[PDB]
């Protein structure tokens, strides 16, 4: 159906391990949007073509206002090109690295969002599992859309793949190679709601080794000007032991969010 002669390719809005993700407009309607491109050589080569068919039939079926959409996809023998809704205000990521932090009604509002799409998710028995700011975009009323479901499963679930890159958002059952399942993403919703009040994450650490350790053992402290609101929603979140941590309708009911965020459930 579609090919790439039906698109005007533009400005680079972004790069990851895989993809390179471009700007587009296509020529018949002037509908404007994203085009990820994977190259086949690479998808081979690191063994991930399973993740990739699963990036396409999950999202794909979502439709969520705070989930981002997928539209369509073709090949062409060297690469792989994602049709994808344009997110027009950038990344949450590069939000973090122009304030340094987020004050305490960006932060609750940015975690109701969250909490809303994941619930929407976990509904379905999808778990997200790389949930972090490089993977969160922003619609042009700056309201957060979840993207990236390259490692997006079914719960329960094991870990066949690799980890690529930094361990700073993952659980212990996660690193640890054990078995793992809705309660991943609400690790990784404590870790973020660390890094938007104070600017990085609670384990970060200057090895991957000494990394793991921190997490594995939970060891994370709070600067002083951290509440004590936003201290126990984060507390509840970090615990080792996952059926420990809270349900997505408890973060949404907490009263440091209630108070501070300016969007509902
Ligand atoms: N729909 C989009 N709109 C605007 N920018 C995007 C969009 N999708 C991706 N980007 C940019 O490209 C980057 C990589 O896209 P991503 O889908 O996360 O690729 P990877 O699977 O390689 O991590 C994002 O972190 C962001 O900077
Ligand atoms: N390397 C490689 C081989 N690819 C693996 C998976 N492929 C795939 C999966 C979902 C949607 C679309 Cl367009 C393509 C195509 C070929
Ligand atoms: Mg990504
Ligand atoms: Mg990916």
Redesign the pocket.
């Known amino acids: 159906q579609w090919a790439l002669e039906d698109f005007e390719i533009g400005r680079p ?7 390179n ?1 471009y700007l587009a407009r296509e020529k018949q309607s002037k509908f404007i949007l ?1 085009l ?1 491109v994977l190259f086949k050589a690479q998808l081979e080569k690191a063994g991930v073509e399973h993740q990739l068919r699963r990036e396409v039939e999950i999202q794909s079926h979502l439709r969520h206002p705070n989930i ?1 959409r997928l539209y369509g996809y073709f090949h062409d023998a060297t690469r792989v090109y994602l049709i ?4 027009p205000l ?2 949450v ?1 590069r939000e973090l690295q122009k304030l340094s932090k987020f004050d305490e009604q960006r932060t609750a509002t940015y975690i109701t969002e969250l909490a809303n799409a994941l619930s929407y998710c976990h509904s379905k028995r999808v778990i997200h599992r790389d949930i972090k700011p ?2 969160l ?1 922003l619609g042009s009323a700056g309201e957060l859309k979840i ?2 479901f ?1 490692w997006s499963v079914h719960a329960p679930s094991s870990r066949r793949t690799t980890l690529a890159g930094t361990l700073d958002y993952l659980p212990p059952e996660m690193i640890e190679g054990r078995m793992h399942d809705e309660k991943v993403d609400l690790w990784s919703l404590g870790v973020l709601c660390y890094e938007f009040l104070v600017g990085k994450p609670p384990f970060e650490a200057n090895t991957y080794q000494e990394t793991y350790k921190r997490i594995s053992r939970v060891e994370f402290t709070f600067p002083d000007f951290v509440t004590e609101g936003a201290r126990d929603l984060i507390s509840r979140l970090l615990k080792h032991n996952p059926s420990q941590r809270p349900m997505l309708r408890e973060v949404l009911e907490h009263p440091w969010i209630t108070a501070n965020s300016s969007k509902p459930s």
Do not use: I, R, S
């Open positions: 809005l972004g790069k990851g391990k895989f993809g993700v994203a990820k981002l994808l809704e344009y997110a950038g990344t990521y490089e993977n975009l993207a990236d390259g």
